[PDB]
Design a protein around this ligand. Structure first.
Ligand SMILES: Nc1ncnc2c1ncn2[C@@H]1O[C@H](COP(=O)(O)OP(=O)(O)OP(=O)(O)O)[C@@H](O)[C@H]1O
Ligand SMILES: Nc1ncnc2c1ncn2[C@@H]1O[C@H](COP(=O)(O)OP(=O)(O)O)[C@@H](O)[C@H]1O
Lengths: 151, 180, 40, 479, 507
């Protein structure tokens, strides 16, 4: 159990690391696009420097994107190159979380397979014994040795 | 520090004390211009075939035939006595820098492309209220890495204020890649 | 040649005087019984 | 106080600029604005109100333009009976973690030697309890002593035995100076002196200490310290001893460990100070820098300093300039050898390289002089047969030569003896052999009244009684 | 921990708010720069250029400043701006280094992850003084036999390993490292575990990779770290690597734990110092070295120490390594390091090719600490062993000329040959202390004199297997009591008798 918890902690850490990494990369790319697109940001930055010689649009856009991201609920989002930084980052979020849960949890397809094809076909009220079965009982045993050795 | 630094400090000192500043300044400027225009005075200075007596004689004839102070003549006699006449140019440069630094600085500065008279006025007045130095003669330049935001260096070395777009952006990024 | 001669000399002397010390230890207590603790 | 500004920094060398009132050479400067205390000693004047100085502590963390304060005098060390029982640095600071030195006086480590008119005293005999020493190289009470040897021969062990057998009985004081030796060794010496009463530390309820008694002073410039410190720590200890000599009129002992490091720590900075190198890599100012020390180390008509210096000899080469220049400065000499230490003959003293100004018939009688010279003749005769034995063999030697070889081997094995501080290597107990006992036993062995005995009896023994006992024992186990 | 959206973004938003010296390169060449400016530099501090490269300021001259670069000089262009960070050169410390491979500055090169360490430490530091120390009383089990018996090593010692090229220096150190995995697996007491540091100066990356492979193949990396300053790596990194290793080891020394550090090719450090001073125009000494080589090695080796019970009780042992040329130990660097160490372990090619491997010469090799760094059970045997080997070394040279000798001398020769054939060992085959004790008991009490010399190499292994299989309890008793009572003496003798009964050899 201790090794399991060390592994899951490390996975969570690397998840959040990669998350903030991409959140910064994408905010930066978005600003590099918006600056070169819009005429206004140029004179805004000029005025910002002038008043600084005695907020700039870079910090302004950064703070704006962060505030707009902080209340997104990234589970509800769309595909990877979907434009808006939230749609760019939630794809990574969800994909990494799936690659996490598939490695520290059992999959519902693996469950369903045996639950509907193997186990209950034996017997009902108690699921008594197992001689009434094919050779794939051995495969079920292998599934055991996967499941308990991932959980 | 250096040899030319020594002679330049001595000259700036004595010319501030006794004779005048502007006289010796103009004298050094005239000598430097004659050195860079004549193209034979330089060889006369560098060549070793010229005897010390011919050197001093030609130097005194330049003294008399041109608007010339006694301090500069003593400088030239010293440089000849110590075999330092080729350092006349360097000495002159050292003398030149101090006076213009005493009076007013020249500063470098960069943009993307041609700005406007309006923001030029704003830039100069903002840098003037920042300096509180009443004389400022600046430069304009164009380097587009700092995207358009006006970057510069008010020339005193220990103040390079990096008001730029890309620099603040990258610094911010490298800051916010911090852990947690 | 140097360590050779030195070690050969040391070994030869050691063996020779080991033999001689054995002989002297044999013939000591007879000729000097005042040390022999048998008589004390 | 003057004020100066650091101008550049190169290793242990610091060039400083003053606006006015340059300090003389050898004066001390304190750096201001540093983490710990940092002291500089002037060494040169370069001109333009610039000086060049040597740092006592590391220059790491120094800045150009950093400020410097002249003290108006060289490095002044505190002095008195308050330094006793206590450990001190090159700059007088204590490093024993017991409090500050409440000394009522200080001396400059740089002084001038006593002149020729201040003569020495009689060559007093010093009894160490060591046989080869007391016999062939008698130690003087008021003169310099040298222990020359390489690495792994028993120098500091011999010094510890001498301290046990001399300093405790001594009524005067004593000083130890560690010049670039090991810190484990310093700790061991401090612990053994606290054990054996040479130091008497008594902690108090109010957190203070009391070093009453404690007839010893310690000084350390060890390996971890830089040059300038390794160089000046000997001057520091020598001033601490000059205090007791001149004013209190006391008799003093002065042990020094690896004085060679002094010279090394000169050569480490000379080329940075702009000097051209001399021969193999030492400095030009070797003999004068050493003589200004040694001439301050001398007996006068107010007191006496018996000194004992251990001299590292790199690669067992006694032709090196540092030992070559140091042999002339010593009254007594004692050279340790590896060819002898390999035979387990401890102390590994070479009696054909050991000398002494004292070994003369008028000082030690003819019973001693002739005995010593007969022993040396016997050993040289034995050395002049090594090749004949290695080539031909013992079969060729006559019975005269066999008798010579037997007696010389017995003397060789007999001069060995076990020390009290070598219990943790040998396990055997220590011995103190008086000089008349040594002379009696040597006269007996040379006269031939012990040829009947074997050779393994004369090993780690302090007399003839033990030899006869061991021979009896070996004969019993022989039968 | 914390959650990203509601917490971290708010934090960074609160973090971003903020607003409101330098020099220029003047000369460049051979991995060294000369700057004009930066009048407020600490001598020895880190410096940053305008291309990511780093440097260290050493020569604070009046006009210019002398910086040494941690990399190639193609990036510097005689005019580039330069900035000082104010930090003196320092490195991370902790257990995050264990299992990792790093350069001279703590930057990892394994290729797997960053360095998880939060506390840093200055590279060049003041060694600990006379008072916060104590005597050496604990042994450092090397795994070898001749070392553990005749040249013992304690915890707090500084023992030199000096020899020629290709003699078994790295192999000695690797066996010292490998012997510790049992001692560490069979405990969770950090005061008793021994961690390890291997500084490699001048080595090639192929060799360092081979060493890392040999350690991973034996699980001997979870308690070691490595500091590789190879030949392509610049001179300042080669110059800094051993100080970085001592910095990483002072964490153990100060935190109540123990440690061992192996400087490999300690002469490449002096080569690099010569190179630096000669490219900084500093004047040389003898053999073109400077005079500060003694203060180069003293700083480093005086950091090894055994601390007292008030400072935790830790330790830092040192095992420097030196390659001589033609066996010349009359040189400068060997002389300095022999003169500043508590022992010596000489290694020879004549003994390496005669069949003695490890080729340790036990005459020249010494250990000033000695028996105090030795177990009593090992004292009892090793005193007799040293005496017998001294006699054999004295006599064998004369014996080899075909003379005819008595039995009291033939016994000396036989026992010396037996012991010389016992002290041989295979590479990466270290042994426990109890097993060394048992084997040397068999060798000293005369259960190998009649046996043939060539058969001892299998006598040893068969006896080892026998006592490991059927007599582990004797070994556990020796490991615990650390002595040989009469009971264990009798049990061991009986076991040896049973073994010789059960087995048969050529004599
Ligand atoms: N006990 C041993 N048994 C068998 N072979 C050994 C033993 N010890 C060393 N060798 C061999 O000695 C050679 C050198 O190995 P090692 O890595 O120790 O080099 P080194 O002694 O450090 O010298 P260098 O690093 O200069 O090459 C190797 O060929 C090794 O196999
Ligand atoms: N009488 C002795 N008994 C036992 N060991 C001794 C004796 N004399 C010397 N040793 C040797 O002295 C050595 C210590 O040398 P030391 O004086 O500490 O430094 P150095 O090598 O500079 O003289 C020990 O390694 C030890 O082997």
């Amino acid at each position: 159990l201790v090794e399991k918890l060390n592994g899951i902690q490390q996975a969570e850490k690397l998840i959040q690391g990669s998350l903030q990494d991409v959140m910064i990369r994408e905010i930066v790319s978005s600003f590099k696009d918006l600056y070169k697109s819009r005429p206004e940001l140029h004179d805004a930055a000029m005025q910002s420097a002038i008043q600084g010689l005695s907020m700039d649009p870079v910090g302004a856009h950064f703070k704006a994107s962060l505030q707009e991201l902080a209340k997104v609920n990234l589970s509800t989002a769309t595909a990877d190159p979907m434009g808006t930084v939230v749609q760019r980052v939630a794809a990574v979020f969800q994909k990494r979380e799936k690659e996490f849960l598939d490695t520290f949890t059992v999959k519902a397809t693996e469950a369903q397979e045996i639950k509907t094809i193997v186990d209950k076909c034996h017997k009902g009220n108690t699921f008594d014994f197992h001689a009434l079965s094919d050779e794939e009982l051995r495969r079920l045993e292998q599934l055991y040795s996967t499941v308990n050795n991932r959980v | 520090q250096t040899l030319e630094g020594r002679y330049a400090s001595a000259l700036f000192r004595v010319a501030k004390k006794k004779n005048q500043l502007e006289k010796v300044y103009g004298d050094l400027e005239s000598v430097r211009n004659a050195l860079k225009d004549s193209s034979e005075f330089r060889l006369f200075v560098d060549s070793p075939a010229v005897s010390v007596q011919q050197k001093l004689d030609v130097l005194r004839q330049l003294v008399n035939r041109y608007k010339f102070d006694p301090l500069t003549g003593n400088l030239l006699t010293t440089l000849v006595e110590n075999k330092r006449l080729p350092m006349l140019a360097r000495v002159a440069d050292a003398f030149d820098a101090m006076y213009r630094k005493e009076k007013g600085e020249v500063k470098c500065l960069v943009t993307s492309a041609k700005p406007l008279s309006a923001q030029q006025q704003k830039e100069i007045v903002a840098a003037l209220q920042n300096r509180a130095g009443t004389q400022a003669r600046l430069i304009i330049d164009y380097a587009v890495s700092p995207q358009i935001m006006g970057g510069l260096v008010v020339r005193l070395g220990e103040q390079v204020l990096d008001f730029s777009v890309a620099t603040r952006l990258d610094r911010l990024q490298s800051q916010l890649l911090a852990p947690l | 040649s140097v360590k050779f001669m030195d070690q050969k000399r040391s070994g030869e002397e050691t063996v020779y005087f080991k033999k001689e010390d054995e002989a002297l230890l044999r013939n000591l207590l007879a000729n000097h019984p005042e040390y022999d603790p048998k008589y004390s | 106080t003057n004020h100066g500004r650091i101008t550049q920094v190169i290793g242990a060398v610091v060039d400083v600029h003053f606006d006015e009132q340059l300090p003389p050479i050898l004066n001390s400067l304190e750096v201001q604005g540093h983490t710990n205390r940092l002291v500089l000693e002037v060494a040169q004047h370069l001109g333009e109100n610039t000086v060049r100085t040597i740092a006592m502590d590391a220059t790491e963390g120094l800045v150009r333009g950093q400020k410097v304060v002249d003290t108006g005098a060289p490095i002044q060390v505190p002095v008195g009976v308050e330094t006793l029982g206590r450990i001190m640095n090159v700059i007088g600071e204590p490093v024993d973690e017991c409090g500050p030195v409440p000394a009522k006086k200080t001396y400059s480590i740089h002084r001038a030697a006593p002149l020729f008119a201040d003569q020495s005293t009689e060559p007093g005999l010093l009894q160490t309890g060591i046989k080869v020493v007391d016999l062939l190289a008698p130690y003087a009470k008021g003169g310099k002593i040298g222990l020359f040897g390489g690495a792994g021969v028993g120098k500091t062990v011999l010094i510890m035995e001498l301290i046990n057998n001399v300093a405790n009985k001594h009524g005067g004081f004593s000083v130890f100076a560690g010049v670039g030796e090991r810190t484990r060794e310093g700790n061991d010496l401090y612990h053994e002196m606290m054990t054996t009463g040479v130091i008497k530390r008594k902690k108090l309820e109010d957190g203070k200490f009391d070093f009453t008694g404690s007839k010893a002073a310690l000084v350390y410039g060890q390996m971890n310290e830089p040059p300038g410190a390794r160089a000046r720590v000997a001057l520091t200890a020598l001033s601490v001893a000059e205090y007791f000599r001149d004013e209190q009129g006391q008799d003093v002992l002065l042990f020094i460990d690896n004085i060679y490091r002094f010279t090394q720590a000169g050569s480490e900075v000379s080329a940075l100070l702009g000097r051209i190198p001399s021969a193999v890599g030492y400095q030009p100012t070797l003999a004068t820098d050493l003589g200004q020390l040694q001439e301050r180390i001398t007996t006068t008509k107010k007191g006496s300093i018996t000194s004992v210096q251990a001299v590292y000899v790199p690669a067992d080469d006694l032709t090196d300039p540092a030992p070559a220049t140091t042999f002339a400065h010593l009254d007594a000499t004692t050279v340790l050898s590896r060819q002898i230490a390999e035979l387990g003959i401890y102390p590994a003293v070479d009696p054909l390289d050991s000398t002494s100004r004292m070994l003369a018939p008028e000082i030690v009688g003819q019973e001693h002089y002739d005995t010593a010279r007969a022993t040396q003749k016997l050993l040289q005769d034995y050395k002049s047969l090594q090749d004949i034995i290695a080539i031909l063999g013992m079969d060729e030697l006559s019975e005269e030569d066999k008798l010579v070889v037997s007696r010389a081997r017995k003397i060789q094995r007999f001069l060995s003896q076990p020390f009290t501080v070598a219990e943790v290597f040998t396990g055997k107990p220590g011995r103190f052999v008086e000089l008349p006992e040594t002379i009696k036993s040597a006269q007996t062995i040379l006269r031939g009244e012990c040829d009947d005995l074997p050779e393994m009896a004369f090993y780690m023994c302090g007399g003839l009684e033990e030899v006869r006992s061991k021979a009896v024992k070996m004969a019993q186990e022989a039968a | 921990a914390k959650i990203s959206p509601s917490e971290m973004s708010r934090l960074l938003e609160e973090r971003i708010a903020g607003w409101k010296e330098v020099g220029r390169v003047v000369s460049v060449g051979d991995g060294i720069a000369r700057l004009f400016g930066l009048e407020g530099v600490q001598a020895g501090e880190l410096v940053e250029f305008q291309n990511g490269m780093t440097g260290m300021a050493l020569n604070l001259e009046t006009d210019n400043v002398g910086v040494v670069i941690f990399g190639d000089d193609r990036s510097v262009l005689e005019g580039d701006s330069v900035k000082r960070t104010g930090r003196i050169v320092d490195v991370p410390i902790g257990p995050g280094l264990l299992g990792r491979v790093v350069d001279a500055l703590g930057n990892p090169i394994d290729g797997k992850g960053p360095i998880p360490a939060k506390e840093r430490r200055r590279v060049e530091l003041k060694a600990p003084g006379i008072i916060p120390r104590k005597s050496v009383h604990e042994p450092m089990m090397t795994g070898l036999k001749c070392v553990d018996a005749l040249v013992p090593v304690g915890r707090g010692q500084r023992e030199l390993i000096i020899g020629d090229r290709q003699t078994g220096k790295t192999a000695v150190a690797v066996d010292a490292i490998i012997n510790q995995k049992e001692i560490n697996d069979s405990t969770d007491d950090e005061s008793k575990k021994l961690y390890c540091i291997y500084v490699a100066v001048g080595q090639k990356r192929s060799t360092v990779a081979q060493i890392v492979k040999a350690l991973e193949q034996r699980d001997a990396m979870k308690y070691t770290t490595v500091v590789a300053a190879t030949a392509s790596e610049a001179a300042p990194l080669q110059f800094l690597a051993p100080y970085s290793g001592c910095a990483m080891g002072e964490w153990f020394r100060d935190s109540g734990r123990h440690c061992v550090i192996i400087y490999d090719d300690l002469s490449k450090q002096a080569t690099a110092y010569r190179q630096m001073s000669l490219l900084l125009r500093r004047p040389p000494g003898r053999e073109a070295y400077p005079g500060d080589v003694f203060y180069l090695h003293s700083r480093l080796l005086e950091r090894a120490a055994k601390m007292g019970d008030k400072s935790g009780g830790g330790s830092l042992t040192a095992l420097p390594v030196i390659e001589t040329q033609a066996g010349d130990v009359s040189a400068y660097i060997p002389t300095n390091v022999i003169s500043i160490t508590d022992g010596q372990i000489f290694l020879e090619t004549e003994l390496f090719y005669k069949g003695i491997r490890p080729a340790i010469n036990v005459g020249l090799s010494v250990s000033r600490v000695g028996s105090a760094a030795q177990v009593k059970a090992m004292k009892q045997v090793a005193g007799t062993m040293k005496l017998e080997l001294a006699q054999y070394r004295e006599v064998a040279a004369f014996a080899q000329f075909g003379s005819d000798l008595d039995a009291s001398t033939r016994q000396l020769l036989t026992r010396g040959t037996a012991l010389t054939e016992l002290l041989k060992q295979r590479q990466y085959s270290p042994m426990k202390n109890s097993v060394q004790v048992c084997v040397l008991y068999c060798g000293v009490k005369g259960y190998l004199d009649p046996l043939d010399p060539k058969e001892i190499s299998r006598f040893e292994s068969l006896f080892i297997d026998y006592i490991n299989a059927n007599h582990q309890d004797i070994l556990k008793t020796i490991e615990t009591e650390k002595e040989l009572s009469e009971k264990t003496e009798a049990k061991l003798r009986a076991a040896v008798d049973e073994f010789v009964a059960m087995n048969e050899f050529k004599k």
